[PDB]
Each structure stands twice: as structure tokens, then as C-alpha cells.
Design a protein around this ligand. Structure first.
Ligand SMILES: Cc1cn([C@H]2C[C@H](O)[C@@H](COP(=O)(O)OP(=O)(O)OP(=O)(O)O)O2)c(=O)[nH]c1=O
Ligand SMILES: Cc1cn([C@H]2C[C@H](O)[C@@H](COP(=O)(O)OP(=O)(O)OP(=O)(O)O)O2)c(=O)[nH]c1=O
Ligand SMILES: [Ca+2]
Ligand SMILES: [Ca+2]
Ligand SMILES: [Ca+2]
Ligand SMILES: [Ca+2]
Lengths: 362, 362
DNA sequence: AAGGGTCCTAGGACCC
DNA sequence: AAGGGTCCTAGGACCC
């Protein structure tokens, strides 16, 4: 059970999509803004200090030449996201989406097939594509090294297909599990790829500077761990398993501690079509009357075009306004607009934000 | 979309299984007891006032000749339950389990096929099997009547197969939806079947004496409705839809009101294998120390034989003690006994009853 | 109540 | 934070 996983991570996704549709901006520092924040920017702005989720006031101070584009509508980003995922599904069907700009692909079966076709002659000619983490020396007699290098040839083939067929650049990380692949995909960060050989796994995890940098350890876990004196990856590695179970739970304990060692057995799960369709909208309390209806009529309006185009139909609705939410099934005659409004207004009456969600698709 | 549903309801299920294994009791009034209650009894005891979930002290007062058998282990009942369900799956694959002794079967496709094979000659010879609700007159030119009578021939074939192949008696109710089928299956209650023709649907629902008798309206709904002055089925029929939405919710409102009219569009859902495996055990606070471990070791012990025999493996565990519960995933090396005990004891420490549940089967 | 099962809600963590 | 997504917990209703 020696897996070959690849983590694909696109560069400044939103900026890439905007730069593509308008080539004019491709040359100047671009900032995609939602409300009062530059949520992402092309790398030109990165040099000028423009940073992720940065106030537009601040962002313009550091870069007064910034060109700002609105990214509050994710229709184009979402479409490109699934074009990327489908391209990777062409390589291997088992592709896991993480957000809009990241994908895991299990290449294990793919790598084995490519090797069963080779012979001793070319097995020595097996080369690497991209960087080798920590400049580690390859050993062509280590079968795991060869499988990982083939995994890097596939990753390079994916990255070339994305730019050729979709015009997108991105990073790739090849490793033996999802954790390590995702940690190594960013070592060389602009449109580059890296492969992690087993001997350097500890070097990689210890390269992290705080346990919060481990995928799987969020804010709550990080701040709990930070209460037991744990802070570095080695602090978690060498902590007492026994205390850790009591504070977080047998589940959280044994999993994140394994993560601290670079161990992660979680499988790459086929994402498939989405389980929910939603659309939000924040504002400075702008809604405090029945205007909220017209708002809900707007969130609703766009959603219907999406949940219909999908092909599958939703059987549950959620209204959201920490948030709160009330939900309820959807009638059958309804499943086949005016009824949906009032439905969501009684969900409202029972109860700055107005998010509508269609779930329970069949 | 004119469905032909059948509701199968076995008579005194537990008593039937006990009477079968021991024929000696078949002749005397039998009471299956769990702790201090006769949960069910054969019909001989029914004459003597022995009633469902009746104190053994009371039950023995009314019938001092009662023979009591322990039914705290449901292994044999559960096995027979699935033998019945599988027998009905042989007739039509879409079978829905409700508890251990009830099944819904959608006969729509089956009835249509049987009719497409007939000719005008035998269409007039189409007879009914069992009772016709309210002694309603059949009309052999009403296609829905003919479909429902064919549904009653199938139901009679099911009931004969259960007694012949499994030795069990039971009731059958043929109607156009699950609600009406289940309400009509009990009109003639000992080892008999009834069919509901559309003209008598209102007679059936109004035969009910309180809205709590409607499947779908439990205790909470009944006691809410009872606060708005609603009590009879007609009270709910003629109540304001508008108030009802506010008090219970758009979902609960429109569904139970439809039920009050005998309308129920819910589909017969294939149950398949179970989604969870559990085993409970009540006691008079008997457990207040580490003995609870030995208990958990016992609940666990038996469960493993069940969750293994299934073929699928569980990926989540629940410990229960209104109840409360803590749950957590299950390690992989574990998925393939000593580890499980302590796992459940840390679930314990975090927290009269000790129920263990295996869920998340794959 | 007994012993045993459904599915649904709200909210909770996490990810981008 | 923005706008948008995962899956998991605990408890809640319901059924026999
Ligand atoms: C980290 C993070 C990212 N994002 C999303 C929203 C932005 O559009 C987008 C910007 O991050 P990215 O563009 O993905 O980060 P990057 O520009 O360094 O490129 P890469 O992905 O290869 O690292 O990520 C969040 O919404 N919330 C978050 O907490
Ligand atoms: C109504 C009800 C039944 N049961 C289960 C447990 C008993 O073993 C069993 C006894 O009821 P049944 O035997 O099913 O009822 P019955 O003897 O009148 O025959 P029929 O099913 O055809 O009506 O039902 C409950 O556990 N809780 C309940 O609230
Ligand atoms: Ca990213
Ligand atoms: Ca980047
Ligand atoms: Ca019953
Ligand atoms: Ca009965």
C-alpha cells in the first residue's frame, strides 16, 4: 500500500481567470476584491506587499497603481474550477476537490501501469520532472523513488495540459499521502512542482514553524494545543499521547499526532458533482425590513439557473443569516419561483447576511 | 401515477417466534417480557386483558396462568424479520422496513405487468382476495379498482408464502399510498387482509378517533395540535393552513394536513441492509463503577459477532447512557477487541443505560 | 416503558 | 474577513 498522490494547487486562481478574460490587466498588479478586501492578487502585486485578504485601503497604500476587479460573483471561477478538475479526472478518475483551486489525485494505479510497461533498459533512464525536495539524491534501485518520479512525470503532464487546454498555471506536489503532497506542492511556489522522497519527510514537517501550518489542525485545535504548551511540530510529536486524548478526544488526538509525523492514511475521495448550491451576500445591516425579501428574491433568482443546469434537483433548502439557519424540505410540485420565495420568508420569520442553500440533491 | 402499495403487518411477532421454537406454549397465553413489562403476547392472552407493554405484576393479575418468556435478546426476532423482508423482496425488490414486524412493498409495476398479460375475458373474472374496506361495492370497469384487486391477490400470495415458507401469520393492507395501506391493514386484525378502494378513503381516515392515530403524527405533534384546539381528523382537515405553518413549520404543516385527508406521496424506500448495529441494556442504576467497563465489554462482545457476520465494516462508534451520547471514528488497524474497550471507556470518561452502536458501515 | 431502529436539524469543526 | 464549500456531532423527532 505505497500510494503516489499528487496535490495540484493553482496560482492566484481568481487573478488568473480575470487576467485571462481581460489580457489588458496581464502586465499590471491585479487585485480581486470582495467588499473591502483584496482576497487575492496576481504575483506582480505580491512583490508590492499586496497580501491575501487585505483591506483595499491598505492594499492601495502599498500599491497605488493596483487595478481592482470585482470578484463577488464566483460564476466564472467556479466554472474554471470544474474544468480543471475534469481535466485531472481524465488522467485518473479519483480526484478530490479542496476549495476552488486545489485537487488531489491518486496516481497509484496509474504509476504502476506505466511501470509494468517499461523494461530494465528504460528503468535506469527514468528521470524526474521538477524539483526534488531538499535536493535529495535519487536512487534508481529504490522502487519507491521510481514510483515517485513517475508520479512527477504525470504531474508535469497534468500541469502542461492545464496551460495548453485551459491556459492556467499552477503547482504540483507528488508524495506518498495527501498531507505530504499538499505540504510539498508549495515549496517552489510559482508555476513549479516538487516531489518528496521518503527520506526527507521529517525534514519537510519540521520545516513547519507552528502546528497551525499542518493541514487538519485549524484554529480551535491550534489554540487548544497551544494551551498544553505545544507549539512546534516536535512538541506535538513528543507530547504524551495520553493527555492529548483527554483534551481533544481519541479521534482528534491520534489523527493530528500522526499528522505531526507526516503520517496520513486518509484516502483521496472522489468529489464528483457538488452536494450543495449556495449564494451569500454581506452588507452593513443594509437589510432590516421586507427589502430582505427582495434580497432573498435575488439570491434565489441566480441559484435557480445553477441548480437547474446541474441536472439533479434539490430536496432541501437552507436560509442563513457564527451564523444561524433554518431549513425544510421542498414540495414535489415545487421541485418541478413564487412559491419558493414565501417558503423562505416563513423560514425567515421564524428567525447583515442572507445566504440561500440548495442541498439534498438527487 | 396511481400506485398500488401493500402494508404487511405480522401478528404478535415475538410471540409467533417463541411459539414456533417451543410448540408447547402454542395453546396457553404467552407473554414476551423485557425487564418488568410484557411487551407483547399471543392473542390468547389478548382475550384475558394482557396488553402491550403491561407490567408483569398487572399482567399476571389479569392472567395468572400466563407463561412468560424472556425477549430481551432480539437475535431470533431480528433474524426472522429479515427472512420476512427477503421473502417480500422476492415478489418486488422495493421493500421498506418499519420496525421488525412491518413492511411496505410497492406493487405498482408488479400489478401492471400482471394486467398486461390478461385479456377482456378474465378481466371480468378478476376477483378480490380478502376483505374490501367498508364492504364497498367493486366496479370491474374502474381500472383503479382492478389494479387494487390484483394488489390484493398479490398480498394474499405474500401472506401464504410467509406461512408456508416461514410459518408466520400476518395482516396485509392494499391501498394507493403508504398511509392508507398501513391504516387499512389492521381493519381485520388477526391473520386477515383488507383492500381500500378510493371511494372509501374518507370513511377510513374519519374512522380514526384522534389525530395521534395518524402515522406521522407522534407525541410532540399531537400535543402541539392539541394546543390549537385540534383533536379530530376533521379538525385538522378544516384548520387554517396558515396558522398551522407558523406553529409547526411549513414542512410539518403541509405534510400532516395532507395526511389528515388521506394524501401521502412519500415513496416506498428500499431499506436494504441496516445502517447501524446496536445493543442496549437497562438496569436500576446497577452500574456506578468500573463494572460499567465489564458491561461495555458485554454489549461490545455480542455486537462484534453481528457487525462481522454482516460483511460490511463500521467506521464510527457511539456510546449512549432523554439519553446522551459521544461518538468517534474507528482506527483502520482496529477495523480489522481489547482496543475497542478502552476507546469506549474514554468516550465514557468524557461523560442506568449502556447502549453501544456501530454505524457508518461500508 | 423494552430493545431496536429510521431520517432530519443546527451547529461545529475544517478547507480554499 | 469574502464567497463558497466539506463532513461530523448531539440531539431531535419519528417508527415498531
Ligand atoms: C487561505 C485561504 C484561501 N482562500 C481562497 C480565496 C482566494 O481567492 C484564494 C487566494 O489564495 P491562492 O491564490 O490559492 O494562494 P496563492 O496566490 O499563493 O496561490 P496558491 O494557491 O498556489 O498558494 O484562496 C480563502 O477563501 N480563504 C482562506 O483562508
Ligand atoms: C406500538 C409499539 C410496538 N412495539 C413493538 C414491540 C413488540 O414486540 C410489538 C408488539 O406489537 P405487535 O405484535 O406488532 O401488535 P399486534 O400484536 O396487535 O399485531 P400487529 O403488529 O399486526 O398489530 O411491537 C414497540 O416496541 N413500541 C411501540 O410503541
Ligand atoms: Ca491555494
Ligand atoms: Ca501562490
Ligand atoms: Ca405491528
Ligand atoms: Ca395484532
Amino acid at each position: 500500500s505505497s500510494r503516489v498522490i499528487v496535490h495540484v494547487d493553482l496560482d492566484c486562481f481568481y487573478a488568473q481567470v480575470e487576467m485571462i478574460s481581460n489580457p489588458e490587466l496581464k502586465d499590471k498588479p491585479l487585485g480581486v476584491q470582495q467588499k473591502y478586501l483584496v482576497v487575492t492578487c496576481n504575483y506582480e502585486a505580491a512583490k508590492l506587499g499586496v497580501k491575501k485578504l487585505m483591506n483595499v485601503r491598505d492594499a492601495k497604500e502599498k500599491c497605488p497603481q493596483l487595478v481592482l476587479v470585482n470578484g463577488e460573483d464566483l460564476t466564472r471561477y467556479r466554472e474554471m474550477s470544474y474544468k480543471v478538475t475534469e481535466l485531472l479526472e481524465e488522467f485518473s478518475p479519483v480526484v478530490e476537490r479542496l476549495g476552488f483551486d486545489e485537487n488531489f489525485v491518486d496516481l497509484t494505479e496509474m504509476v504502476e501501469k506505466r511501470l509494468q510497461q517499461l523494461q530494465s533498459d528504460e528503468l535506469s533512464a527514468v528521470t524526474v520532472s521538477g524539483h526534488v525536495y531538499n535536493n535529495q539524491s535519487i536512487n534508481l534501485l529504490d522502487v519507491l523513488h521510481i514510483r515517485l518520479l513517475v508520479g512527477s512525470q504525470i504531474a508535469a503532464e497534468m500541469r502542461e495540459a492545464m496551460y495548453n487546454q485551459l491556459g492556467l498555471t499552477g503547482c504540483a506536489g507528488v508524495a506518498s499521502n495527501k498531507l505530504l503532497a499538499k505540504l510539498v506542492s508549495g515549496v517552489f511556489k510559482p508555476n513549479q512542482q516538487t516531489v518528496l522522497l521518503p527520506e526527507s519527510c521529517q525534514h519537510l514537517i519540521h520545516s513547519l514553524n507552528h502546528i497551525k501550518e499542518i493541514p487538519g489542525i485549524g484554529y480551535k485545535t491550534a489554540k487548544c494545543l497551544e494551551a498544553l504548551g505545544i507549539n512546534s511540530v516536535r512538541d506535538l510529536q513528543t507530547f504524551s499521547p495520553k493527555i492529548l486524548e483527554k483534551e481533544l478526544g481519541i479521534s482528534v488526538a491520534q489523527r493530528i499526532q500522526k499528522l505531526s509525523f507526516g503520517e496520513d492514511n486518509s484516502p483521496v475521495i472522489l468529489s464528483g458533482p457538488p452536494q450543495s448550491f449556495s449564494e451569500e451576500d454581506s452588507f452593513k445591516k443594509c437589510s432590516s425590513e421586507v427589502e430582505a425579501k427582495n434580497k432573498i428574491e435575488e439570491l434565489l433568482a441566480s441559484l435557480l439557473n445553477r441548480v437547474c443546469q446541474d441536472g439533479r434537483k434539490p430536496h432541501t433548502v437552507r436560509l442563513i443569516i457564527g451564523r444561524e439557519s433554518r431549513q425544510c424540505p421542498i414540495p414535489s410540485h415545487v421541485i418541478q419561483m413564487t412559491p419558493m420565495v414565501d417558503i423562505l420568508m416563513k423560514l425567515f420569520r421564524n428567525m447583515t447576511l442572507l445566504s440561500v442553500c440548495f442541498c439534498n440533491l438527487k
